[PDB]
Amino acid sequence: PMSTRIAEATSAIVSKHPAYQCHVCSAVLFSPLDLD
């Protein structure tokens, strides 16, 4: 994996501290509210 390579690659460079109805469309409705 790319990530694994990148890791190994940097790990060698590391250092440490020393010791209803709608007339518009003609559709039929059922509620006055359903109309509005």
Partner 1 sequence: VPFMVPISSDHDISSAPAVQYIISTEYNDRSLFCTNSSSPQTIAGPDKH
Cβ atoms 32, 20 nearer than 8 A: yes
CB nearer partner 1, residue 6 or residue 22? 22
Cβ atoms 21, 34 nearer than 8 A: no
Q: For the segment 1-36, give every residue that binds partner 1 (CB under 8 A).
A: 21-24
CB under 8 Å to 11, separation ≥6 — which residues? none
CB nearer Zn ion, residue 7 or residue 20? 20
CB of 33 to partner 1, least distance (A): 16
CB nearer partner 1, residue 5 or residue 23? 23
